């Protein structure tokens, strides 16, 4: 019976995928915010971020937590900023944090 | 919790773009106080969420069409030519040109000259009469 | 009762038939 | 009864057959995007994708 | 998973199109920065999924029809012209 409930939760979050829409607080700079919005959308398209986020939340449903990376790496890979999933297994985090 | 961590990843990514992108890269991709970077950015720009909506331009067209639907029929046509411009029609230049022709809006040199000549002639004729 | 139950299973066993149409 | 559920899933997918529709980002290459969409459709038709 | 693999296949097919088709062949079939070819294509063009709708022209006709229904009774006639075209 575990599979039904877990699949329902992950499907519910998958139907609710969202993309960043940068809003300028001042809106004397609406164009910079809109450019940043395209930049984030381009990065999400290149890195396939929505799938990574969906898988991460799927793990946060089954197990305690999930991890997502947003870092900058240098290689022959075209994308400079990479957003990739790391499993709850392969991460060790400090427990002293409140 | 997912929402909170999504805001975290958005802030981190936005800092990464502001750090590691040149203006040339943005120009190719896109046609266009506190000490901390995160607080500095999060002051002027805040992270908001909309549905996936494929490219950004589709979401822009959706918001623009909603605004049109809120607009009355009069003022609706200029919002309409913007919506035609934003919406990914299979044939986009010609629809935009025609909606502009009926609307008269700008943003075409021959059309601008024709409109200016017509306006000047009509105004001069009215003044003479 | 076995006949009735077998008939019911035959009923259980458009969307299911789509592969033949494709 | 596994056959019934598997057939239902495959039928639900097959009803939702989709084709690639390339959308331009920069807005300055709408015609190349449409051309690439037509090439993708041609390849999918010939390969019967 | 199917959607992700479809995006993979679309990007791969787009890459082989960019690499292995000639311009004359494109004109015959149709009336018409990062170092990777993977990211270069995604930079300008994105992949979107739409119903089969047989040929591309039928999808264009559907989009035009919906656009006309959104348009008012005025200015709709020219778009009807292009739809029928």
Interface size, chain B vs chain E, as Cβ–Cβ contacts under 8 Å: 38
Our CA angle for D30, D35, D36, nearest 5°, is 100
Our CA angle for B55, A13, A2, nearest 5°, is 150
DSSP secondary structure, B11-62, as one string: HHHHHHHHHH--HHHHHHHS----SSHHHHHHHHEEEEEEE--SSHHHHHHH
**Pairwise CB contact (< 8 Å): C19 & D10:** yes
In contact, B18 and B37? CB cutoff 8 Å: yes
* SS3 track for E27-82: HHHCCCCCCCHHHHHHHHEEEEEEECCCCHHHHHHHHHHHHHHHCCCCCHHHHHHH
Residue A68 per-residue DSSP state: E
Structural tokens at position D27:
């807005």
Counting as contact any 3 or more CB pairs under 8 A, the partners of A are B, E
The dihedral over CA atoms of E63, E64, E69, E75, expressed in degrees to the nearest 10, equals 150
Residue A1 per-residue DSSP state: -
The residue with tokens 């348009």 is: E71
Among B42, B61, B23, residue whose Cα is nearest residue A26: B42
**Pairwise CB contact (< 8 Å): B44 & A29:** yes
| Residue B11: closest C-alpha in chain A | A70
Q: How far is CA B83 from CA B122, C15, D31, D44, E67, in A?
A: 31, 39, 19, 32, 10
Q: What burial class does residue C15 get, using C-beta atoms within 10 Å of its C-beta: 0-12 exposed, 13-18 middle, 19+ buried?
A: middle
Rg (CA), chain D: 16
| Residue D7: closest C-alpha in chain C | C16
Residue A71 DSSP SS3: strand
**Pairwise CB contact (< 8 Å): A72 & B19:** yes
Among B117, B6, D32, residue whose Cα is nearest residue E32: D32
| Residue B103: closest C-alpha in chain E | E75
Phi, psi values for residue A92, rounded to 5°:
-120, 120
In contact, E14 and D43? CB cutoff 8 Å: no
Structural tokens at position E65:
């029809």
Chains E and A are in contact, defined as 3 or more C-beta pairs closer than 8 angstroms: yes
Q: Residues near A93 by Cβ (< 8 Å), separated by ≥ 6?
A: none
In contact, A40 and B13? CB cutoff 8 Å: yes
Among A83, A66, A82, residue whose Cα is nearest residue A74: A82
The residue with tokens 């919406």 is: B87
Among E19, E40, E35, B28, residue whose Cα is nearest residue A77: E35
**Pairwise CB contact (< 8 Å): D25 & E46:** yes
Phi, psi values for residue A60, rounded to 5°:
-65, -25
Structural tokens at position A93:
């985090």
Experimental technique behind these coordinates: cryo-EM
Among A50, D18, D30, residue whose Cα is nearest residue B50: A50
Among A18, B59, D38, residue whose Cα is nearest residue E31: D38
- Distance in angstroms (rounded) separating the CA atoms of residues A37 and A30: 10
Residue A79 per-residue DSSP state: -
Q: Residues near A26 by Cβ (< 8 Å), separated by ≥ 6?
A: B44
Resolution in Å, one decimal place: 3.8
D11 in contact with C, Cβ within 8 Å: yes
Residue D21 per-residue DSSP state: E
Residue A76 per-residue DSSP state: S
**Buried/exposed B18-27: b ≥16 CB within 10 Å, e otherwise:** eeebeeebbe
Residue B77 DSSP SS3: helix
- Distance in angstroms (rounded) separating the CA atoms of residues B66 and B70: 6
D41 in contact with B, Cβ within 8 Å: no
Q: Residues near B53 by Cβ (< 8 Å), separated by ≥ 6?
A: A19, B59, B62
In contact, B50 and A21? CB cutoff 8 Å: yes
- Distance in angstroms (rounded) separating the CA atoms of residues D3 and C5: 18
Q: At what angle do helices A2-14 and A49-62 cross, to 10 degrees?
A: 150
């Amino acid at each position: 019976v575990i599979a039904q409930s877990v699949n329902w939760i992950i499907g519910s979050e998958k139907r609710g995928r969202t993309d960043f829409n940068i809003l300028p607080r001042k809106k004397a700079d609406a164009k910079p915010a809109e450019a940043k919005t395209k930049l984030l959308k381009y990065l999400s398209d290149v890195n396939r971020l929505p799938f990574h986020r969906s898988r991460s939340f799927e793990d946060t449903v089954k197990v305690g937590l999930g991890w997502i990376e947003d870092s900058y790496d240098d290689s022959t890979d075209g994308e400079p900023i990479y957003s990739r999933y790391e499993s709850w297994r392969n991460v060790i985090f400090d427990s002293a944090s409140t | 919790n997912l929402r909170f961590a999504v805001q975290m990843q958005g802030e981190i990514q936005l800092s990464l773009i502001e750090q590691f992108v040149t203006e040339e890269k943005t120009f190719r991709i896109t046609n266009e106080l506190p000490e901390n970077d995160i607080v500095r950015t999060k002051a002027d720009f805040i992270i908001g969420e909309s549905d996936w909506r494929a490219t950004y331009r589709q979401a822009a067209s959706e918001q623009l069409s909603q605004m049109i639907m809120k607009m009355p029929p009069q003022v609706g046509l200029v919002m309409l030519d913007l919506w035609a411009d934003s919406t990914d029609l299979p044939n986009r230049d010609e629809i935009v040109k025609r909606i502009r022709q009926i609307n008269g809006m700008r943003d075409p040199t021959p059309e601008e000259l024709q409109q200016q000549q017509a306006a000047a002639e009509q105004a001069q004729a009215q003044k003479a009469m | 009762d076995m006949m009735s139950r077998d008939i019911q299973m035959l009923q259980q066993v458009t969307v299911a038939t789509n592969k033949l149409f494709d």
